[PDB]
Amino acid sequence: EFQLQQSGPELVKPGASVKISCKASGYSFTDYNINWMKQSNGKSLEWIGVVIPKYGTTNYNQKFQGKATLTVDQSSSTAYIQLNSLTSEDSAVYYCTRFRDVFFDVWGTGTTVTVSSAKTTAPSVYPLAPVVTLGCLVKGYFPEPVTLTWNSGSLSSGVHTFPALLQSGLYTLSSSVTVTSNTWPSQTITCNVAHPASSTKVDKKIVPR
Amino acid sequence: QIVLSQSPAILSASPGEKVTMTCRASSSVNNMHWYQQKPSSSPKPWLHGTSNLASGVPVRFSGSGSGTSFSLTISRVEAEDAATYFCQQWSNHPPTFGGGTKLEIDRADAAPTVSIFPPSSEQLTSGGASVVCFLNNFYPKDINVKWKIDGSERVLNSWTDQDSKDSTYSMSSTLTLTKDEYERHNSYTCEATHKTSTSPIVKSFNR
Amino acid sequence: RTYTLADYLKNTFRVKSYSLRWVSDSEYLYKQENNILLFNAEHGNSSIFLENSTFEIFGDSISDYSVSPDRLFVLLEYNYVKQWRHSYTASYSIYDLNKRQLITEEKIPNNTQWITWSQEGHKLAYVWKNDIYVKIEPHLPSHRITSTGKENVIFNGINDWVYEEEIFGAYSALWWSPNGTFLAYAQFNDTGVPLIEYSFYSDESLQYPKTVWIPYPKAGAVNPTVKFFIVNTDSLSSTTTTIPMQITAPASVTTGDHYLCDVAWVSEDRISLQWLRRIQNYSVMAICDYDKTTLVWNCPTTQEHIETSATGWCGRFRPAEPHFTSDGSSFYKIVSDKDGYKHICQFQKDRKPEQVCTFITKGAWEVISIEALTSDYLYYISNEYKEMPGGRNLYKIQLTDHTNKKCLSCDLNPERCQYYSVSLSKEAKYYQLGCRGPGLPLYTLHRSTDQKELRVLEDNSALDKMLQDVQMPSKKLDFIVLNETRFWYQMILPPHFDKSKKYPLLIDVYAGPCSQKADAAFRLNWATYLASTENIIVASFDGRGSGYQGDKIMHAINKRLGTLEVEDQIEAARQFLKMGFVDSKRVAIWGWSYGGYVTSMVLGSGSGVFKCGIAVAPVSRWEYYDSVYTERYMGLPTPEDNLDHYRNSTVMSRAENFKQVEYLLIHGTADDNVHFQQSAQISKALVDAGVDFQAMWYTDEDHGIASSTAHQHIYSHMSHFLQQCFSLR
Amino acid sequence: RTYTLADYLKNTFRVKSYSLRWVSDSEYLYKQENNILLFNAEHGNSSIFLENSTFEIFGDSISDYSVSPDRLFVLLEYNYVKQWRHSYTASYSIYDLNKRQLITEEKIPNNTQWITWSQEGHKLAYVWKNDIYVKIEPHLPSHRITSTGKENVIFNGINDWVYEEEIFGAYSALWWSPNGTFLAYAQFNDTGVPLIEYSFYSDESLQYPKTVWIPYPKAGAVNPTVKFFIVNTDSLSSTTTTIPMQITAPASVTTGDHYLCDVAWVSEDRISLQWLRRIQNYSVMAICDYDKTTLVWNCPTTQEHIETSATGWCGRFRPAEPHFTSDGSSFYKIVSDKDGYKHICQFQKDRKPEQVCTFITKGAWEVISIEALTSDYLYYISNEYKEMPGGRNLYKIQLTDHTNKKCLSCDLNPERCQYYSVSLSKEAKYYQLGCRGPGLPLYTLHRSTDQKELRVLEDNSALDKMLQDVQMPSKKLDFIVLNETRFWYQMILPPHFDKSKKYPLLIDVYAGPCSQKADAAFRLNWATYLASTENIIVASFDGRGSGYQGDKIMHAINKRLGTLEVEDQIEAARQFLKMGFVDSKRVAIWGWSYGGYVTSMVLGSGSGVFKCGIAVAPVSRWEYYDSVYTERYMGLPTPEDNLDHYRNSTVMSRAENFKQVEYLLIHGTADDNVHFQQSAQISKALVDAGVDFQAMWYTDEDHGIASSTAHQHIYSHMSHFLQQCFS
Ligand SMILES: N[C@@H](CC(=O)N1CCn2c(nnc2C(F)(F)F)C1)Cc1cc(F)c(F)cc1F
Ligand SMILES: N[C@@H](CC(=O)N1CCn2c(nnc2C(F)(F)F)C1)Cc1cc(F)c(F)cc1F
């Protein structure tokens, strides 16, 4: 019923600044307050600050006083966080949350934000065949988020989306899927790789060698 | 501010067993909160006021405590409960978090499905050759995968999170090489030493 | 069902109250679901002041708030850390009301020991690491006043241990001027003061226990020294050096050791300083004026007002407050008359050859407090109505014609309400009555001219429900005649009390100097449980030494702090046995703090009246307790003064007599007030005498034993003992 | 009438004994009570040595005496002030026996921490303000040996807290050479060792309580360091500066933290030093020789005898004492077999290729101690006779012929005596037998060649005539069988114990590592009152963890001090229920010290076997107790080692289970051994848990609670608790 939704993933160079929103709907937006969090890829969470949508009153953490700046638009019911002057240390996932004067009872989708001097790069897709097990090796992109699905959904069981790994400025995300011996030789199966930043809507079907 | 210490990092327990969970503070806390987070997803609200359920949280979960030692008990753990937990404090501003309470599940054993892939005609086009190998569905996470160039021992690994469906793990071993070095030898070997085995597991392809 | 032990401990039946803060002459502030609201008493409406979302900004860490007199800034207290009874530590941050945001430039530092707004305007002063700071504007840098501060040695603008506890009853030792030009403050030096040292074990993770230490002047030991100062806040600059100015003298009190025991601003260039000797039968109220041509505060002998006492000590616990008029000439003060009765009498700024003051009240009763002073009327509380010392009612008196003495709260509800406490407005044109007992507490708003009830703020309607199926005890306030004079007592009788039947009797005792256990207040406490469930009569008695009944009764125990109130508690029991509803074989006595000393002395007397008894955090001998309190009633522990009674009024001297009784000794290990030493000595004496007793320590608990679980444990542990003593379980 | 509590506390029935100090091979001394008398054993006559008047000049202040080896001087101890278990301070004055008058020139100073004569002659060495002073002649001035001493920081010739309590078991840390040429001593440094701090309230007159503080190394905390020195006593003059010679500990030991645990002079130019790592599973016995030319004590690698233990720790509580021969080449110590049984192994001064040694005794039993070693025979105590770990008998074995294996106390009186202790002469010509139990104690004199009783020293007949109208209890020593292994127990049965009727059971427990409650000794203590008067069966059980029964049993609790011994105490109770003379609805368990910990763990187990129980001065968690004792069994409390079990085996973690029982917690406020902290944490855990229990502190009492009035009070209070619990 109560929905929170943020902007998509982001990339920027050192010294630059970014802004990410937190749209909300359902509850009376002016009543409850908005709190923001930070979490590195393999560390604990970290509280940044808080805002009240009604008056736009802010209160920041001492650690993020001279970095993050919070604002809100109550007409559009959308809260914002403005991160100024980023470095490689700021590379982390950010969340927007609501407070019921008790605890963080509502949470947003979550957004990864990377900071690096390297320019954006597009992924390469390869069809893997058994010469029952299929595959779809994605190799040679950068930012982080590469959405990989089979037939735009459909296949769920047997899927093992392995998270990406860095290799000399090249992210390598592999995948797999398994079914019966009768289904694949006849019918067509295809993996659907997608990377927003570089603008790529890639398709590749698995062909018998 | 208050350094919360989760005890311990990762903890395993079978389905239907008791599971206790504690968050140790440094100074003092009036009311401890808890949050569940599945890998690659936003944290979810679980227990507010130490005991009370959130709007949607099931009835098997409940906690209590005071001072510098609060708790959260889980009655009969299910397969879906396999997710990381965090303790939150806000009796003293600024609020702090724990560290890591990865709720593992103890399941039955199963051997890894050893598949293999040579480089496709598309990847050879770029002037390279990445040999890939797959290991799917297994509880024992310990393994010793290794490649051999017709005998000579020479890799990029990537591991899956715990499945909420069946609590199993998986692995993908990728071997990146050039097209010139790919056209220098014949056979390619992908073996492993898994818990549910002793000697190397055989699986290979030939040109 | 009955009012069980669980109902008391878990606190199911909650007795409500109505707290409010008078901001203006006809406006106040009140809380509602964590939302502080503004009420205007001019109409019958309310306006939203500051929402729960604002306090939520800091989470649940908000312990308290404080709005400035100009209603433009709010002081937000958070990260509360208790120290002693009144002293504590907290972080702070200021909220702007117009701009609706926090002031994050030039902030208040961590571990701020005290803060205060000025009387008029948004000025801030605060104490940090025993040094005073001044902040003219919330956004501007703070000007440092003192740089002598040191932990547990030099205190600037805050009281040490003994001054906090026994003198001011508060941690703060700084006072703003009316308009805000000056800032007065006291300085204490604890260099000679010896240290009490006890162990704090902390949480189980701590491997080696910490040794806590406090500068604590025990009876006869070296006390702290005091120094009063005033600093001009309007002349503070970073260019010039901030130079406070010291008020010296009086010459009479500075002959030996002395105390600063009250201070009040009369005008912007006039201030009254109350002083007191170590021998607390001599008090001087020196009014001092600011000579701006030489920058020194002048204190002549003509403006001094001496106060003495041959029978005992000055005031009840200290010389009372002087309430000055707007112009600053006349001031009213509660003083004992020639008959020995605390009454309001008028003084002028100039003294008289023999300072006789015109007493505006003469009756055989005492004035409790002066609540307000207007241009043409005066508000006060007394124990006059129906000749009950345990009663409290609001009275109004005229300054011109003294005979005009109307009561404000007497017949508003004479059955339900016989114990009132009032919270008046600035110029006293509106007021809130606080009915405490003997019925369910009631809170109402009123207008001063018409004495008309505007509305009912809280009447405990929720508490009226819930208690519909419980066997409620009944309180019985009455007296007896002993040796040609009245002595009032109290009895929480069991539900549907039958005079024909005999019940077990428990004497609830404190019986300290100027104490009053027998009153008309309502309480849902441990005594309610013992009557409701266990059918035990819980009694209380105000014998010789008790207050609010003249200085003949109160000063009867002068230099004799453990003899009359001991024997009068035994006599009270014998009188209850004569009434014929008390089981003589099942009579007990219990008390906390001073009550523990009385309980212990009663059991050690060997009267044979009491079967068993419980002492919680008892004083054992008076040499162990602090100087200010002890030397007020006792002398100094010297052969020249009163060492012989110090040596004779100890509990452990009477250790052999405990064989005739069952004794339960309880004491918290981290008690800073009545140290664990005292019980440790008692127990050691009982061991040497070969008498068997029961004991209980509470790890890391102080004098209150106010930790939730420790509070539940002690009263549950005491219940088992009392059941076993009376053969109930 | 019965043996009442009053009889125990007033101590009307004194269990007499016979002490003595063997001066020569044929003569010994003993106190009449008024005087001391010299008894020659070859004769049957007496010779008065030192009269009552000689002490009476000092009054009742005389606490002890010490006659010199040459019989010319007597060291008179007085103004005794106790410190810890063994440590104390006292004034001293030497008495000339020949001239019969006191030496009043260059006398011994006040608050002397330790004194001792040399092995031969009459040379005195003494510690004062943590500094050693040698005194060749009673009237000569003292010679400072060291000047680094400081209160609670540097200790010269005396043990600090942890060394006194756990390692040596005494306050003295200096050793004279056989001929008074060298004086060895240890130096400890407590700089870095954290402090325990508690309040001592003292007598009523004291206004402000005093804060006592001791350098106390808790489990995992910084231990004190140690240094060994030897000073040349024959070359001490006021012109030349005294320069002691330092011995370096073995290189294998000095890699980390370590201990010095035992010192024994082999000869004049030879000495044995026993070392031990902080991880107490590795002990090196380095024999060091004196270099006459370069003045340095050589310790070659070839003279280092290593001891190890994979199952647990070296020795019982520490590596055993080696007994060297007069020549000083071969020695004997008690060491574990391949089966894990403590027996006497024969060693030489040089080690053998892989530390092999010749066991002169064998079988499923253990040797207790080695009282003497002569040129012809070896004397030792064992628990072999009748396969009784509880029993004690004097044995004798020949050096060459191992099969020549006698017993000198097996058949003296088999009913009255199954538990012996021996005090031999200077070279095993005469000896005293000390029959402790299970009958009334018996003391006799003997000859070594022919086992002939010369006279009865103490028959306890005086006690016998008083215990003829009292209802005496009866001791039942026996065992049970669990998993094909026999665990022994004892039971103090009430007078005329009727097996048809059912009685209340009280489990007396200590159950520490290498402990033995179930034995054949006679005791007229608190247990006899509970049997005689209250008709309560007081029982004890030596489960897994107990010693003198092989290292398989003793090392079962290694790294695990709160699991086997506690549940074996529960299991032992279940066995007593099956026997059919125990009232199952009235069973309790009490213990002091480690027993308090076991009691507390048993009560918090949740077995539902025990109704109530009393823990006196209990350990709560092992992080609080000292390092040497705790780390010997538990190791270090670190994530890399054994922190998990440290956190698991706490009493506070079992707080919620105490709702099923009635618990009495007792602890002295001035306990230096098991600090009041521990019970304070237990009580705080029970309060948070919402459990009701009973408590009692004791102001300014230490671990023993041995003060007269405090001793009477605690046992009266515990007696009331059991009366309330059972009746
Ligand atoms: N220390 C005493 C304080 C007191 O009696 N009052 C509170 C402060 N006070 C009082 N009257 N005026 C004031 C104040 F002005 F200080 F607030 C009474 C109470 C007290 C008395 C004892 F004998 C004892 F063992 C402990 C104890 F806590
Ligand atoms: N600290 C312990 C030492 C000991 O058990 N022995 C005394 C010294 N000793 C022993 N066996 N050999 C030696 C000695 F060689 F060290 F002397 C027995 C005793 C002990 C154990 C506890 F668990 C406890 F809570 C207190 C306590 F006092």
Short mmCIF file of C-alpha atoms in Angstrom, two decimals, chain C residues 194-199 201-204 206-209 211 216-219 221 621 623-624 647 650 652 676-677 679-681 683-684 687-688 691-699 709-710 713 717, chain D residues 194-199 201-204 206-209 211 216-219 221 621 623-624 652 676-677 679-681 683-684 687-688 691-700 709-710 713 717 720:
data_model
loop_
_atom_site.label_atom_id
_atom_site.label_comp_id
_atom_site.label_asym_id
_atom_site.label_seq_id
_atom_site.Cartn_x
_atom_site.Cartn_y
_atom_site.Cartn_z
CA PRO C 194 38.48 13.23 51.70
CA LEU C 195 37.30 10.60 49.21
CA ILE C 196 34.79 7.79 49.63
CA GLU C 197 35.92 4.86 47.47
CA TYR C 198 33.73 1.92 46.42
CA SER C 199 33.85 -0.72 43.68
CA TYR C 201 31.57 -4.07 38.87
CA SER C 202 29.69 -2.98 35.72
CA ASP C 203 28.55 -5.49 33.08
CA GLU C 204 30.03 -9.01 33.20
CA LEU C 206 34.39 -5.97 32.44
CA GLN C 207 37.25 -8.10 33.78
CA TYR C 208 38.63 -5.82 36.52
CA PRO C 209 36.12 -3.84 38.65
CA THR C 211 37.03 1.92 41.80
CA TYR C 216 32.55 13.25 50.28
CA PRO C 217 32.74 15.21 53.54
CA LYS C 218 31.71 12.84 56.33
CA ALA C 219 30.64 14.19 59.74
CA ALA C 221 35.72 15.95 58.13
CA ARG C 621 26.33 5.36 62.81
CA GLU C 623 30.09 9.45 61.66
CA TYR C 624 29.72 7.68 58.30
CA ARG C 647 29.23 6.87 70.04
CA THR C 650 25.03 3.51 66.72
CA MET C 652 26.01 -2.07 66.10
CA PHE C 676 27.52 0.12 51.70
CA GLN C 677 30.09 0.57 54.50
CA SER C 679 25.44 -2.01 56.50
CA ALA C 680 28.82 -3.75 56.20
CA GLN C 681 29.63 -2.57 59.74
CA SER C 683 26.46 -7.07 59.65
CA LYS C 684 30.00 -7.47 61.02
CA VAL C 687 28.39 -11.69 63.24
CA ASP C 688 30.67 -10.93 66.22
CA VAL C 691 23.21 -13.36 66.18
CA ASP C 692 21.65 -14.89 63.06
CA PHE C 693 20.11 -12.55 60.48
CA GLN C 694 19.25 -12.31 56.78
CA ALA C 695 21.10 -10.12 54.29
CA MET C 696 20.94 -9.00 50.67
CA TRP C 697 23.29 -6.88 48.56
CA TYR C 698 22.44 -5.38 45.16
CA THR C 699 25.34 -5.15 42.72
CA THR C 709 14.75 -5.51 37.75
CA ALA C 710 16.41 -4.59 41.07
CA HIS C 713 13.59 -8.13 43.07
CA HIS C 717 12.25 -10.54 48.21
CA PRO D 194 46.77 -5.04 36.34
CA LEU D 195 45.32 -4.53 39.83
CA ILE D 196 42.32 -5.99 41.60
CA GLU D 197 40.80 -3.28 43.81
CA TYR D 198 38.32 -3.84 46.64
CA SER D 199 37.20 -2.06 49.82
CA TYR D 201 36.05 -1.44 55.89
CA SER D 202 38.10 -2.40 58.99
CA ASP D 203 36.86 -1.85 62.54
CA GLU D 204 33.96 0.49 63.35
CA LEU D 206 37.56 3.81 60.75
CA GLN D 207 35.52 6.60 59.14
CA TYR D 208 36.47 6.24 55.45
CA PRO D 209 36.91 2.69 54.09
CA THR D 211 40.81 0.58 49.13
CA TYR D 216 46.51 -9.79 40.15
CA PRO D 217 46.95 -11.35 36.70
CA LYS D 218 43.51 -12.53 35.54
CA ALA D 219 42.98 -15.04 32.71
CA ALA D 221 45.92 -10.46 31.31
CA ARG D 621 33.25 -17.11 35.07
CA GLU D 623 37.90 -14.70 32.98
CA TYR D 624 37.75 -13.35 36.56
CA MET D 652 25.42 -16.07 34.81
CA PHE D 676 33.60 -10.69 45.59
CA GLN D 677 33.16 -9.51 41.99
CA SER D 679 29.31 -13.52 43.24
CA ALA D 680 28.34 -9.89 42.60
CA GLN D 681 27.99 -10.74 38.89
CA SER D 683 23.62 -12.12 41.90
CA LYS D 684 23.20 -9.35 39.30
CA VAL D 687 18.21 -10.21 39.60
CA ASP D 688 17.94 -9.36 35.89
CA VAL D 691 14.91 -15.20 40.06
CA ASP D 692 14.47 -15.07 43.84
CA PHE D 693 17.34 -16.38 45.97
CA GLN D 694 19.10 -15.95 49.32
CA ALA D 695 22.41 -14.18 49.91
CA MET D 696 24.90 -13.32 52.64
CA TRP D 697 28.08 -11.24 52.49
CA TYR D 698 30.79 -11.26 55.16
CA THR D 699 32.51 -7.94 55.83
CA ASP D 700 36.33 -8.04 55.66
CA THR D 709 32.89 -15.51 64.69
CA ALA D 710 32.47 -15.48 60.89
CA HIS D 713 28.00 -17.66 61.68
CA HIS D 717 23.37 -19.88 58.57
CA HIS D 720 19.35 -23.10 59.11
#
